[PDB]
């Protein structure tokens, strides 16, 4: 709130008022987008090339209100982090303008790339092999049945369950393989505030029809119904998907699944406990690396663990096992 | 009746989808490269488009961006050969993201959606 | 030929006379197999545990005469190189005994492992991805046709050519993928003397039935019919297989394939020229790395290039392209 | 008539071969682990064996070596789940090497061979 001489010897900032027009184009902003304040002053922000969405983000911010932090945005050769913050003018208190803050980022993500990706090569060696093996195994069956069913000819149709589902069990393994092949090629990250439980439910909603099939005494408790978190919704989404996914058959027929979201002063704890066969002392960590069971956690490690931060570990209990993670509300604590 | 323009690299992969969407209730006009996908959209009427990425000419990424700037209310479904969870910056300009598996029952639900 | 006090302050040696009994167990031999000369003297060599084949190698040497150099032999924790050399006693000149020489090897192959395999991780990253992609592509077709053919039901049988062969074209790609997945996991090497051309023919023999199909003006020349080489037959075998393989359809229908084995004082040159579409200046090397065409050389690089040594490059000519390699007769020159 | 003992890890993979060799003209008795593959060979009459490698109990590598020391004239065909070009030291004691693809027309030629 004054001064505004200081205003411009720092990182970078842009103001979009009730259309998308700029009032102040920071001096370090210039030093990033090649043009000076004056010859861009009071212009619209979508007007610029290779640019676009930045506006479209401010747009739906104008309509949803609530601000955003982004992480991972490719502009030309540089990667980016951006910070959106809509505000109001206290004299009017109207629905005034939007503050886009930008952190000088590249001389960072490229120097925590080489302590990550250069180590991502290695596991994509041993594992590439060890799992590339798990490829042929149903391959030789699915391909093999094609050199088995094609000499009857035309079976009493009963060769459809034993064809599709065995073809299908490798198919979603191809998925849960390509999905791990993702774990090499990326690195977007999109942080938002939202009620966790509002997510928690949301997921179960989708599964429902099947959980309803396997007559499951599902059970969800929480000590708080008002629980918010800054994080990538779209993504901490998957995380749930796949604890749940596993604790689906992992307890299976007439099996039970208990979800728990417990508020703690600075951090939250979501847990998916199921019953039946636990897993021993050795596999407390040793399922974390790509490795599958008699699963495919993998990503779900680095999602909580490396993306947001925190932990995604597990334990035995109550003649069953649980899948727990913890991420502080605001990642701004790191 | 609706008409869709579906674009991909391999000749064997295009012929597969054409006759999967003509099953649901559509007519498919097939295009090959991004420079010929542009010409197949300009002087006509097309309510949807399905695109890859890693292709000769230009990237399906940049391709979709050419459809957005011209036609403001264009319908862009991305479905590249390497599909996961919409994680590149350019795709937010594009509408919906489809994951390429032999499973064709995801695109059908989402082609059907973006036509109302 | 005397002295035999010196005999025993070096590397390692073992003599098997006309059964497989030892006359001299080198002092450095002891220092490798835990037992002294005397309590193993005049015993049979297959008698020892985890041992075996060493004898069986000397065996078929007793029957085939001609000696062998081996490279890559796991004995317990150590890797190995061994040297077999049957000999005769000039006074008798009979079919006397076999000399097994052993080179102290591990403090070598493990210290040219980490300048190889630690770099093998890296390509098995980018490529693992880039090619893991080439997996789904026909996967989505072969899996996709299963969710296409299973609703007719039972077609006029004409859906067999378009099912099997498209399933088949990924299947041998799975091969030519696992085959590249090999290129990580190994590292045996078995050097023998043999007439190259005697190999050269041998290969064509197998292909014949198909080359006969595509009425091919095949053409094989050589300036020498007596051409021997120390190398891994079993393996420089594949090499041929796959030049030939490519220069098969690469010139295809009414197409021509010219093989050439030209003796040079210290080294040999085998070339497979075919006609049609050459490949430009850029791909002189840029097909070497895993990369395929509109192939999969890969292994065939390191086979000639890194295993035996030498080169396996290519060039344009005569409105067609050739596939040439050169390996000295005796690898003992390195 | 000939009787073969075929050993592998997954239950789904064993049932596939049993009914592929009973097509040619054989009878298949299936074994699971290397410690039970040994018991299924000792007090009987079996003219051939097909083995994997990466398995619980012990490695098909070492497994084949147990069949060689006992029965000098035993017939060992290796066919592990990760098959290429016979490149480990132990396999030279074993007889013939088979490459596991959905292609079953290599083993048939080589099972047929090592029975004369």
| CA–CA distance, C139 with C134 (Å, rounded to integer) | 9
For chain B, give the residues followed by a break (C–N over 2.5 Å). none
What lies within 8 Å, CB to CB, of B91 at 6+ separation is B61, B64, B78, B97
Instruction: Reduce the DSSP state of residue D40 to 3 states and report it.
Output: helix
Q: How far is A241 from chain D (nearest CA, A)?
A: 28
What lies within 8 Å, CB to CB, of A255 at 6+ separation is A214, A216, A274, A275, A276
Residue of D nearest to C48 (CA): D69
Same domain, A238 and A281: yes
Same domain, C161 and C250: no
| CA–CA distance, D22 with D10 (Å, rounded to integer) | 19
Does residue C259 contact residue C270 with C-beta atoms inside 8 Å? yes
- List own/partner pairs for A181-184 with CB under 8 A and 24 or more apart: A181/C128, A181/C129, A181/C132, A181/C133, A182/A299, A182/B84, A182/B85, A182/B87, A183/A120, A183/A298, A183/A299, A183/A302, A184/A120, A184/A124, A184/C125, A184/C128, A184/C129
> Beta-carbon neighbour count of residue A263 at 10 Å?
18
C294 annotated among ligand-binding-site residues: yes
Domain D2-116: state its class: alpha beta
Instruction: Reduce the DSSP state of residue B61 to 3 states and report it.
Output: helix
Resolution in Å, one decimal, please. 3.8
Is it the case that chain D and chain B have 3 or more CB pairs lying under 8 Å apart?
A: no
Q: What is the 3-state secondary structure (H, E, C) of chain C?
A: CCCCCHHHCCCEEEEEECCCECCCECHHHHHHHCCCCCCCCCCECCCCCCCCHHHHHHHHHHHHCCCCEEECCCECCECCEEEEEEECCCCCCCCCEEEEEEECCCCCCCCCCCCCHHHHHHHHHHHHHHHHHHHHHHHHHHHHHHCCCCCCCCCCCCCCHHHHHHHHHHHHHHHHHHHHHHHHHCCCEEEEEEEHHHHHHHHHHHHHHHHCCCCCCCEEEECCCCCEEEECHHHHHHHHHHHHCHHHHCCCCCCCEEEEEEEECCEEEEEEEEECCCCCHHHHCCCCCCCCCCCCCCHHHHHHHHHHCCECCEEECCCEEEEEEEEECCCCCC
Question: Phi and psi of A259, rounded to 5°?
Answer: -100, 140
Q: Domain containing C259 — which CATH number?
A: 3.30.565.10
Instruction: Reduce the DSSP state of residue B94 to 3 states and report it.
Output: coil
> Beta-carbon neighbour count of residue A261 at 10 Å?
20
Query: What is the number of residues in chain A?
Result: 334
Residue of C nearest to A131 (CA): C181
Question: In whole angstroms, how far apart are CA D22 and each of A150, A260, B106, C79, D15?
Answer: 17, 54, 42, 42, 11
Same domain, A194 and A334: yes
Q: How far is D81 from chain A (nearest CA, A)?
A: 7
| CA–CA distance, C175 with B74 (Å, rounded to integer) | 43
Name residue C314's beta-bridge partners.
C323
Does residue C310 contact residue C326 with C-beta atoms inside 8 Å? yes
Same domain, A117 and A213: no
| CA–CA distance, C273 with C248 (Å, rounded to integer) | 10
Question: Phi and psi of A102, rounded to 5°?
Answer: -125, 130
Write out chain B residues lying below 8 Å of C133, CB-based.
Answer: 54, 81-82
Structure tokens at B8: 């991909």
Strands A228-231 and A189-195 come out as antiparallel
Same domain, A221 and A300: yes
Same domain, A195 and A323: yes
Helix axes A117-146, A161-185, angle to 10 degrees: 160
Q: Where are the domains of chain B?
A: 2-116
* Cα-to-chain-centroid distance, residue A279: 26
Q: Which of C172, C188, C204 is the last residue of a domain?
A: C188
For CA atoms A312, A236, A192, B87, the dihedral sign is positive
Q: Which of C61, C82, C106 is the last residue of a domain?
A: C106
| CA–CA distance, C305 with A7 (Å, rounded to integer) | 63
End-to-end CA, chain C: 28
CB contact under 8 A, C133 and B82: yes
Structure tokens at A287: 């399922």
Same domain, A114 and A174: yes
Complete DSSP assignment for A212-273 = TTTT---EEEES-S--EEEE-HHHHHHHHHHHHTHHHHTT-TT--EEEEEEEETTEEEEEEE
Instruction: Tell whether A178 is within 8 A of chain C (Cβ).
Output: yes
| CA–CA distance, A60 with A64 (Å, rounded to integer) | 6
Same domain, C264 and C231: yes
User: Buried b vs exposed e over D14-28: b needs ≥16 C-beta within 10 Å?
Assistant: bebbeebbeeeebeb
Structure tokens at A27: 């001096």
**How many domains does the structure of chain A reveal?**
3
Q: Domain containing C163 — which CATH number?
A: 1.10.287.130
- The structure was resolved experimentally with X-ray
Query: What is the number of residues in chain D?
Result: 116
Does residue C268 contact residue C327 with C-beta atoms inside 8 Å? yes
**Structural Rg of chain C based on CA atoms:** 25
Determine whether C241 is exposed, middle or buried from the number of CB atoms within 10 Å of its CB (0-12, 13-18, 19+): middle
Does residue B15 contact residue B32 with C-beta atoms inside 8 Å? no
Same domain, A227 and A316: yes
Residues A33, A34, A37, A39: what is their CA dihedral angle, to the nearest 10 degrees? -120
Q: Which of A125, A120, A126, A131 is nearest to A292 (CA)?
A: A131
Does residue A246 contact residue A277 with C-beta atoms inside 8 Å? no
Same domain, C207 and C298: yes
Same domain, C9 and C88: yes
| CA–CA distance, A108 with C195 (Å, rounded to integer) | 60
Same domain, C69 and C94: yes
Q: Which of A183, A197, A175 is nearest to A270 (CA)?
A: A197
Instruction: Reduce the DSSP state of residue D7 to 3 states and report it.
Output: strand
CB contact under 8 A, D85 and C182: yes
**Structural Rg of chain A based on CA atoms:** 25
Instruction: Tell whether C116 is within 8 A of chain A (Cβ).
Output: no
Q: Domain containing A91 — which CATH number?
A: 3.30.450.20
The residue range of the domain holding A290 is: 189-334
Does residue C12 contact residue C104 with C-beta atoms inside 8 Å? yes
CB contact under 8 A, A171 and C143: yes
């Amino acid at each position: 709130f004054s001064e505004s001489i200081l205003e411009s010897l720092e990182t970078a900032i842009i103001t979009l008022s009730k259309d998308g027009r700029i009032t102040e184009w920071n001096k370090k902003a210039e030093q990033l987008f090649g043009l000076k304040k004056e010859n861009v002053l009071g212009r619209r922000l979508k007007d610029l090339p290779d640019f676009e969405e930045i506006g479209s983000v401010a747009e739906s911010v104008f309509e949803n209100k609530e601000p955003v932090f982004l992480n991972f945005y490719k502009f030309g050769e540089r990667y980016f982090n951006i910070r959106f913050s809509p505000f109001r003018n206290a004299k009017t208190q109207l629905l005034e303008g939007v503050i886009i803050t930008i952190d000088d980022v590249t001389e960072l993500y490229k120097y925590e790339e080489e302590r990550k990706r250069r180590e991502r090569l290695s596991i994509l060696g041993e594992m590439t092999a060890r799992v590339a093996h798990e490829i042929r195994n149903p391959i030789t069956i699915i391909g093999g049945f094609i050199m088995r069913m094609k000499k009857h000819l035309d079976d009493p149709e009963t060769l459809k369950k034993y064809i599709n589902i065995i073809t299908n069990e490798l198919s979603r393994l191809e998925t849960i393989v390509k999905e791990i092949l993702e774990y090499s090629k990326e690195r977007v990250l999109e942080f938002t505030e939202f009620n966790l439980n509002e997510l928690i439910r949301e997921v179960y909603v989708l599964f429902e029809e099947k959980i309803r099939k396997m007559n499951i005494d599902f059970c969800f408790e929480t000590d708080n119904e008002d629980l918010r978190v800054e994080a990538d919704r779209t993504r901490i989404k998957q995380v749930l998907i796949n604890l749940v996914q596993n604790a689906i058959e992992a307890t299976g027929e007439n099996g039970k699944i208990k979800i728990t979201s417990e508020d703690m002063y600075t951090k939250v704890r979501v847990s998916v406990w199921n019953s039946g066969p636990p897993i021993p002392e050795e596999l407390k960590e040793k399922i974390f690396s790509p490795f599958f069971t008699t699963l495919g956690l993998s990503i779900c490690r680095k999602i909580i663990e490396d993306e947001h931060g925190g932990k995604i570990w597990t334990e035995n209990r109550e003649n069953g096992v649980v899948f727990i993670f913890e991420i502080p509300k605001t990642p701004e604590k790191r | 009746m609706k008409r869709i323009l579906v674009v991909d690299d391999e000749p064997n992969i295009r012929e597969l989808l054409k006759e999967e969407l003509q099953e649901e209730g559509y007519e498919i006009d097939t295009a090959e490269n991004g420079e010929e996908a542009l010409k197949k959209f300009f002087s006509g009427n097309y309510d949807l488009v399905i695109l890859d990425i890693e292709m000769p000419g230009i990237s399906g990424l940049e391709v979709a961006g050419e459809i957005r700037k011209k036609k403001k209310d264009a319908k862009i479904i991305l479905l590249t050969a390497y599909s996961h969870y919409r994680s590149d910056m350019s795709s937010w300009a594009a509408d919906e993201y489809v994951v390429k598996s032999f499973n064709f029952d995801e695109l059908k639900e989402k082609v059907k959606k973006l036509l109302s």
